[PDB]
Ligand binder design. Structure first.
Ligand SMILES: CCOc1ccc2cc(-c3nn(C4CCOCC4)c(N)c3C(N)=O)cnc2c1
Ligand SMILES: [Ca+2]
Ligand SMILES: [Ca+2]
Length: 421
């Protein structure tokens, strides 16, 4: 009775800043000591629809599993607010990276932009349009060199109530927000990465250039840049959306494939054999065992644990869409053998393995499912991790979870620990 949803699992550490829809704070899990980012949205001030509609949309966002899209874990609430808890990212906005470097080589801008293309492509396939894509709405996961980027600030426009001029498409000036407007804003970003200037440079004047749609590669720094880059930018800053290319086309452009070739090497063999061994054990264990492992890999893990497996996941992602498909696993298995020196069926193993790892039936293995099968089970079996998992299921809080109270797909905690092992 005297226990609250959020305040019982989480402790507020500090305030990270003001998201447009609500305050954003850093919070800590009281058991696992794992830190998180939570947006606190005031129900009375911010709501436009029913609480049911909101939670339905947030459920859809919570199942967006893409390396370049912000991760959301759960949606709680009390009498005054919604609490949306998500993965914490500490590298800051991409806008600041641009102030420091002030422009990027074609090699550096391609690694960055390839990730934006991957995330936007994923968002559109799940029928989400950012409508406000810019560097300020892209965060870096950490301070390391080649860390992945993360797209934020999208999804709640319909549900809640709450520099932009450079990045908006002309049709947005005329009351149209279709999927193409994002491809326009991405083009402006890529224009700024290579040159350091907005293609369209008072705000009435900036918007005036946007309305005409006139941009030029006249700045002295474009002479050195390649023709394929200019081909991509032209197809993205096409005035008419019906002729403008798609996010998928942006990702597949030859320019991207030139600088997007992260491929396995002999240095990665230690982490590939480990990943392979855990994957076999995963396929051997019964369905009940497997699902419990996915549940904990997808809800109770952090980046630092999966940091080694992130690079392996990124190298196996030839097309850079963010997912590993049936063919990509066959080729990664054949190349894993080649680096060792072993002659290589592999195809039969993977086809038998695809249903077992693609627990959602999505047609490909997303990152969370890859971690659940490629990580040492010992890491997931930590006592605090199992404490949190057990407490999630016991809605009553009696101390024993009923048989139906198990939705991992009377038992004491100590009986629960043995069951996982
Ligand atoms: C359905 C909506 O759900 C969510 C869930 C998680 C979110 C996290 C952030 C976030 N903002 N910031 C700062 C804040 C000050 O400005 C710079 C960036 C972080 N360092 C964040 C993080 N996740 O680490 C923002 N919006 C979120 C919305
Ligand atoms: Ca892929
Ligand atoms: Ca999947």
């Amino acid at each position: 009775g005297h226990m609250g949803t959020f305040a019982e699992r989480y402790n507020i550490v500090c305030m990270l800043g003001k998201g447009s829809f609500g305050e954003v704070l850093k919070c800590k899990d009281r058991i696992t000591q794992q830190e998180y980012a939570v947006k606190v949205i005031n129900k009375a001030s911010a709501k436009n629809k029913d609480t049911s509609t909101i939670l339905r949309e947030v459920e859809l966002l919570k199942k967006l599993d893409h390396p370049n899209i912000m991760k959301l874990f759960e949606i709680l609430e009390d009498s005054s607010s919604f609490y949306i808890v998500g993965e914490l990212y500490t590298g800051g906005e991409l806008f600041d990276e641009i102030i420091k470097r002030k422009r990027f080589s074609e090699h550096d801008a391609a690694r960055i932009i390839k990730q934006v293309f991957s995330g936007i492509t994923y968002m559109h396939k799940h029928n989400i349009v950012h409508r406000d894509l810019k560097p300020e709405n892209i965060l870096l996961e950490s301070k390391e060199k080649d860390c992945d980027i993360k797209i934020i600030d999208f999804g709640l426009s319909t549900c809640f109530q709450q520099g932009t001029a450079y990045y908006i498409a002309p049709e947005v000036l005329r009351g149209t927000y279709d999927e193409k407007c994002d491809v326009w804003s991405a083009g402006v970003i890529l224009y700024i990465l290579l040159s350091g200037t907005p293609p369209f440079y008072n705000e009435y004047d900036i918007l005036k250039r946007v309305e005409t749609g006139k941009y030029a590669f006249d700045l002295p720094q474009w002479r050195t840049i390649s023709d394929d880059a200019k081909d991509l930018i032209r197809k993205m800053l096409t005035f008419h959306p019906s002729l403008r290319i798609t996010a998928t086309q942006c990702l597949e452009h030859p320019w991207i494939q030139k600088y997007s070739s992260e491929t396995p090497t002999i240095s990665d063999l230690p982490s590939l054999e480990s990943a392979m061994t855990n994957i076999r054990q995963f396929q051997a264990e019964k369905k009940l065992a497997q699902a419990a492992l996915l549940y904990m890999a997808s809800k109770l893990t952090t980046l630092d644990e999966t940091k080694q497996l992130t690079e392996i996941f990124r190298k196996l992602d030839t097309n850079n869409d963010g997912m590993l498909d049936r063919d990509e696993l066959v080729r990664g298995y054949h190349e894993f053998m080649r680096l060792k020196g072993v002659d290589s069926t592999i195809e039969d193993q993977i086809d038998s393995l695809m249903p077992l790892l693609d627990m959602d039936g999505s047609g490909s293995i997303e990152y969370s499912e890859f971690i659940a099968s490629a990580i040492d089970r010992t890491i997931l079996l930590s006592r605090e991790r199992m404490e949190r998992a057990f407490k999630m299921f016991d809605k009553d809080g009696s101390g024993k979870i009923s048989t139906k109270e198990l939705f991992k797909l009377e038992v004491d905690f100590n009986e629960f620990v043995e069951m996982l092992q």
